[PDB]
């Protein structure tokens, strides 16, 4: 199974076993399965990560400025900031997506994408 690690610049934000993981990159969207080629890819500005899990329901992440890296033994996502779907706020994300600042509008769209919209 995939050893998945979401590492923020200031925290080892999440880690566990996964069956599958989905991300959107500057080369389109990409899924990763328990065996995958060694990869490096930059995520899009309004990125989301969805992780399929064997022990429970899937895990939903909003990500700012993330870089995907894959090796045969593990997937490492290196992230500037990250928020779970269980911690994003729909009014705050909607107000951020309405903002004029490009990074703030990207982070608003990313949290809206983790909220399924």
């Amino acid at each position: 199974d995939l050893n998945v690690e979401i590492v923020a610049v200031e925290r080892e934000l999440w880690s566990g076993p996964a069956t599958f993981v989905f991300t959107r990159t500057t080369a389109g969207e990409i899924g990763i399965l328990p065996r995958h080629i060694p990869l490096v890819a930059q995520l899009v500005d309004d990125a989301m990560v969805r992780v399929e899990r064997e022990g429970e329901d899937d895990l939903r992440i909003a990500v700012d400025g993330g870089f995907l890296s894959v090796t045969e033994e593990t997937v490492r996502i290196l992230v500037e900031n990250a928020q779970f779907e269980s911690e994003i706020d729909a009014d705050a994300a909607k107000e951020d997506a309405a903002s004029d600042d490009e990074r703030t509008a990207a982070w608003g769209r990313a949290r809206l994408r983790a909220l399924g919209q």
């Binding site: 590492v7 610049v9 200031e10 925290r11 870089f67 890296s69 490492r76 290196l78």
Partner: peptide, 20 residues
Amino acid sequence: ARVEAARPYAAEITNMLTEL
């Protein structure tokens, strides 16, 4: 604690930069 929480990211960016 904040230094040791930031340390693993710096080590993995270093690794990714050495590969690139």
